[PDB]
Amino acid sequence: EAEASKFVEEYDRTSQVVWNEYAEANWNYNTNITTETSKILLQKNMQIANHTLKYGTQARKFDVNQLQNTTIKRIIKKVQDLERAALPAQELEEYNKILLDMETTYSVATVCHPNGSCLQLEPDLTNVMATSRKYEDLLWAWEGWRDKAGRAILQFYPKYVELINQAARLNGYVDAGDSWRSMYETPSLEQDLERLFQELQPLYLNLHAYVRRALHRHYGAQHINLEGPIPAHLLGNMWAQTWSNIYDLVVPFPSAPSMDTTEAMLKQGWTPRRMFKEADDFFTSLGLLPVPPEFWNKSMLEKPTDGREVVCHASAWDFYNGKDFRIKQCTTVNLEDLVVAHHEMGHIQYFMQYKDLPVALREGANPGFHEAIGDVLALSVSTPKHLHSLNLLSSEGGSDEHDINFLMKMALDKIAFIPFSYLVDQWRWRVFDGSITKENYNQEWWSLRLKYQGLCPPVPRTQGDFDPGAKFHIPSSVPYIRYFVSFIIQFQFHEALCQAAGHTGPLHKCDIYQSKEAGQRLATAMKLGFSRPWPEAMQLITGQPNMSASAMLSYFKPLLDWLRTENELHGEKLGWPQYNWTPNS
Numbered sequence: 001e002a003e004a005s006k007f008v009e010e011y012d013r014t015s016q017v018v019w020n021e022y023a024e025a026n027w028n029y030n031t032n033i034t035t036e037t038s039k040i041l042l043q044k045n046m047q048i049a050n051h052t053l054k055y056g057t058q059a060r061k062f063d064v065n066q067l068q069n070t071t072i073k074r075i076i077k078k079v080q081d082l083e084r085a086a087l088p089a090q091e092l093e094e095y096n097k098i099l100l101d102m103e104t105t106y107s108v109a110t111v112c113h114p115n116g117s118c119l120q121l122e123p124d125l126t127n128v129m130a131t132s133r134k135y136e137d138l139l140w141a142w143e144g145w146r147d148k149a150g151r152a153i154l155q156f157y158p159k160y161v162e163l164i165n166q167a168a169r170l171n172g173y174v175d176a177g178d179s180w181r182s183m184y185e186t187p188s189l190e191q192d193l194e195r196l197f198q199e200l201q202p203l204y205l206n207l208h209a210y211v212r213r214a215l216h217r218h219y220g221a222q223h224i225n226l227e228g229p230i231p232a233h234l235l236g237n238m239w240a241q242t243w244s245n246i247y248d249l250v251v252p253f254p255s256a257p258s259m260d261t262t263e264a265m266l267k268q269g270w271t272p273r274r275m276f277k278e279a280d281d282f283f284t285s286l287g288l289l290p291v292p293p294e295f296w297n298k299s300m301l302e303k304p305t306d307g308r309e310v311v312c313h314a315s316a317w318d319f320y321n322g323k324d325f326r327i328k329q330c331t332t333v334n335l336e337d338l339v340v341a342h343h344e345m346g347h348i349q350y351f352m353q354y355k356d357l358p359v360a361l362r363e364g365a366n367p368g369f370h371e372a373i374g375d376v377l378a379l380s381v382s383t384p385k386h387l388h389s390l391n392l393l394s395s396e397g398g399s400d401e402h403d404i405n406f407l408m409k410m411a412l413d414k415i416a417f418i419p420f421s422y423l424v425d426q427w428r429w430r431v432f433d434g435s436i437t438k439e440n441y442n443q444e445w446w447s448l449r450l451k452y453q454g455l456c457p458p459v460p461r462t463q464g465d466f467d468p469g470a471k472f473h474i475p476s477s478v479p480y481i482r483y484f485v486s487f488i489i490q491f492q493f494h495e496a497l498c499q500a501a502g503h504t505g506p507l508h509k510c511d512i513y514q515s516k517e518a519g520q521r522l523a524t525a526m527k528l529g530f531s532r533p534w535p536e537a538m539q540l541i542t543g544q545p546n547m548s549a550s551a552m553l554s555y556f557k558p559l560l561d562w563l564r565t566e567n568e569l570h571g572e573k574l575g576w577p578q579y580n581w582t583p584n585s
C-alpha cells in the first residue's frame with residue numbers, strides 16, 4: 001500500500017506535465033486553427049494515449065477493495081478505467097475507424113434544395129428552425145436533415161454499440177450504459193431520476209399545453225390538435241430540445257421592456273473586458289478567489305483580427321498549472337453574452353478553488369456539478385433586480401408580469417431542456433442494455449419522445465431511417481444526463497444561497513450579491529472537487545443529501561399558477577392520451 005501511495009505521487013507529477021502539454025496545444029489550436037497546429041496537437045494526442053495506457057495498465061494491478069486511504073481509493077478506481085484502451089488493438093483500431101466515419105458523416109452532411117442549393121446544420125439551417133413560420137419549410141428542413149444526416153448513421157451505429165459495450169465490459173461494467181451511469185456514483189440513479197421527472201410533470205404539462213395553444217392559433221387546427229401531443233418539428237429547434245426560439249409566439253405579456261439592455265450596454269460603454277470585469281466584481285463580492293493575473297493576458301475575449309481562425313463555442317479552460325486559466329468567447333456586448341460571461345467565470349471559479357487537489361481529482365463533485373455551478377452564479381444576473389442594479393434597465397413599473405416574462409423565458413429553456421436531456425440517455429441506456437435493437441430503434445425513440453416530451457413525428461417513418469443520428473451527441477458518443485442533473489440541482493443551490501443569504505419571499509427576486517456567508521457556503525463545497533461522493537457536497541451546500549426537485553417547483557411556483565390559470569381561461573386540457581394525430585396534408 002505504501003507503493004500505492006508512491007504511485008499516486010508519480011501519477012500526479014507525470015500527468016500534470018502530460019495534460020498541461022495537451023492543454024497547451026489544445027488551447028493553442030482552438031484559438032489558432034492553423035493546420036500545422038493540428039499536427040502538433042495530434043502528436044500530443046499520442047502522448048496522452050501513451051500516458052493514459054501506461055499508467056492505466058499499472059493501475060489495474062492494484063486491488064482497490066483492500067485499501068483504506070480514501071483518497072487513494074477513489075484516485076486508483078478512476079484511473080483503472082482504460083475506456084477505449086481496454087479494447088484489443090485491432091478493435092480499438094476498428095473502434096476509432098468507426099468513430100471518425102460517423103463523426104465525418106455528420107460533419108459533412110447537408111440538406112440541399114432540389115436546385116442543389118445546400119444548407120449546413122449551423123448556423124444556416126438553425127436560422128431556418130429559429131425563424132421560419134412556414135409549416136412547409138420547417139418540415140422540409142427538419143425532415144431533410146434527418147433524411148441525409150440521420151438515415152446515414154445507420155451505416156455505423158450497430159457495430160459502434162457492440163464495440164463500446166465490449167470496451168465497457170473490459171473496464172468492469174455490465175455494458176456501456178452501466179459505464180456512464182456509474183459516474184453519478186449512486187446506484188439508484190434511474191430511480192431517483194424517475195421521481196425527479198414525475199415531480200415536474202404538473203409544471204411541464206401545463207407549459208406544454210400552453211405552448212400547444214400558441215401553436216394552435218398560428219398553425220391552425222389542421223396542424224394543431226388541442227387534444228393531442230405537439231408536432232415535434234415546430235419547437236423552434238432542430239431537435240426540439242430547447243424551445244426559447246418561439247418565445248415571441250408564447251410571451252404572456254407584451255410591454256416587457258423598460259429599456260433595451262443591448263442599446264443600454266452600448267450607451268454605458270460596455271466592453272468584453274468590462275463585462276467580464278463586472279462578473280469578477282460579483283465574484284469578488286462573493287468572497288471567492290480573485291482571478292489570477294495571467295488570465296487577463298491570455299484569455300481571448302474578442303474575435304481575433306490577425307487572420308487566426310477560432311472555434312467559437314464559448315467555454316472555459318484550465319491548464320492544470322495552478323496559474324493558467326482562460327475563457328474563450330467571441331464576446332458580443334449584449335445581455336446574452338453577459339449571462340455567458342458569468343457562466344464561463346463560474347467554471348473558472350470552480351477550477352480555481354479545487355486547484356489544491358491532485359490532477360486525478362480535479363473535476364466536479366459529479367459531472368453535473370461542473371455544469372451546474374456554471375449556471376447558479378449566472379441566475380441572478382438576469383433577474384429584474386440585478387438587471388436594474390447595474391442600470392442595464394432604468395426603473396420599470398413593478399409588475400409581476402415582467403417577472404413572469406423572465407421566468408417563462410427561463411423556463412422555456414430550463415424546463416423544456418429537461419425531458420429531452422432525459423430521453424437521450426435513457427434511449428441509449430436501454431440500447432446499450434441490448435433490450436432495444438435496430439429493428440425498432442425508431443419506435444423506441446419516438447415512443448420515448450411521446451412519453452417524455454409529449455411529441456410525435458410530423459410524418460410516418462419506416463425502417464431505413466434512424467432519426468437519432470440527427471443529434472450530435474449521439475454519433476459523437478457524448479452523454480447528456482449530466483445536463484439534466486445540472487438543470488435540477490442548480491435550483492437547490494440557488495435556494496441554499498438565498499436561504500443562507502437570508503432572502504425571503506418569491507425566490508426569483510433573490511440576489512446573492514455581496515453575501516459574505518453565501519459565497520463561503522459554496523466555497524467549502526467546491527474545494528472538495530471530485531474526491532467525495534457528490535452527496536457530501538450536496539449536503540454541505542443545501543442541507544440535504546439527495547437531489548430534490550422541490551426547489552425547482554417552488555422557484556417556478558408563480559409561473560405555474562399563471563400558466564395553470566391560463567389553461568382554465570382557455571379550458572385547455574392537460575396531457576396527451578390521444579396518441580395518434582399529426583398535421584393534415
Ligand SMILES: *[C@@H]1O[C@H](CO)[C@@H](O[C@@H]2O[C@H](CO)[C@@H](O[C@@H]3O[C@H](CO[C@H]4O[C@H](CO)[C@@H](O)[C@H](O)[C@@H]4O)[C@@H](O)[C@H](O)[C@@H]3O)[C@H](O)[C@H]2NC(C)=O)[C@H](O)[C@H]1NC(C)=O
Pocket residue numbers: 032034036037306308
Ligand atoms: C498561429 O500558429 C502559427 C504556428 O505557431 C504561427 O505561425 C508562425 O509565425 C511565425 C511568425 O510569427 C513564422 O515565422 C517564420 O518562420 C519560418 C520558420 O521558422 C522556423 O525555423 C526557425 C529557424 O530557421 C526557428 O527559429 C523558428 O522557431 C521556426 O521553428 C522562418 O523561415 C521565417 O523567416 C519566419 O520567421 C512561422 O513560420 C509560423 N509557423 C507556422 C507553422 O505557420 C502564427 O503566427 C500563429 N498566430 C498567432 C496570431 O500567433
Ligand SMILES: *[C@@H]1O[C@H](CO)[C@@H](O[C@@H]2O[C@H](CO)[C@@H](O)[C@H](O)[C@H]2NC(C)=O)[C@H](O)[C@H]1NC(C)=O
Pocket residue numbers: 005008009069070071072358
Ligand atoms: C491519503 O493519501 C494522500 C495521498 O498522498 C495523502 O495526501 C498527503 O497529505 C499530506 C497532508 O495530510 C500532504 O502534505 C501531502 O503532500 C499529501 N500527498 C499527496 C500525494 O497528496 C493523505 O494525507 C492521506 N489521507 C489519509 C486520511 O490517510
Ligand SMILES: *[C@@H]1O[C@H](CO)[C@@H](O[C@@H]2O[C@H](CO)[C@@H](O)[C@H](O)[C@H]2NC(C)=O)[C@H](O)[C@H]1NC(C)=O
Pocket residue numbers: 113114115116117137
Ligand atoms: C433553390 O430553390 C429555393 C426555392 O425556390 C430557393 O429558396 C428561396 O430563397 C429565397 C431567397 O434566396 C427566399 O426568399 C425564399 O423564401 C426561398 N424559398 C423557399 C421555399 O425556401 C433557393 O434560394 C434556391 N437556391 C438556388 C441556389 O437556386
Ligand SMILES: *[C@@H]1O[C@H](CO)[C@@H](O)[C@H](O)[C@H]1NC(C)=O
Pocket residue numbers: 046049050
Ligand atoms: C507510444 O505509443 C506508440 C504507438 O505506436 C508506441 O510506438 C510508443 O513506443 C509508445 N511509447 C512508449 C514510451 O512506449
Ligand SMILES: *[C@@H]1O[C@H](CO)[C@@H](O)[C@H](O)[C@H]1NC(C)=O
Pocket residue numbers: 293294296297
Ligand atoms: C500583459 O502583457 C503586456 C505586454 O504584451 C504587458 O504590458 C502587461 O503588463 C501584461 N500584464 C500582465 C498582467 O501580465
Ligand SMILES: [Cl-]
Pocket residue numbers: 180183367479482
Ligand atoms: Cl456522464
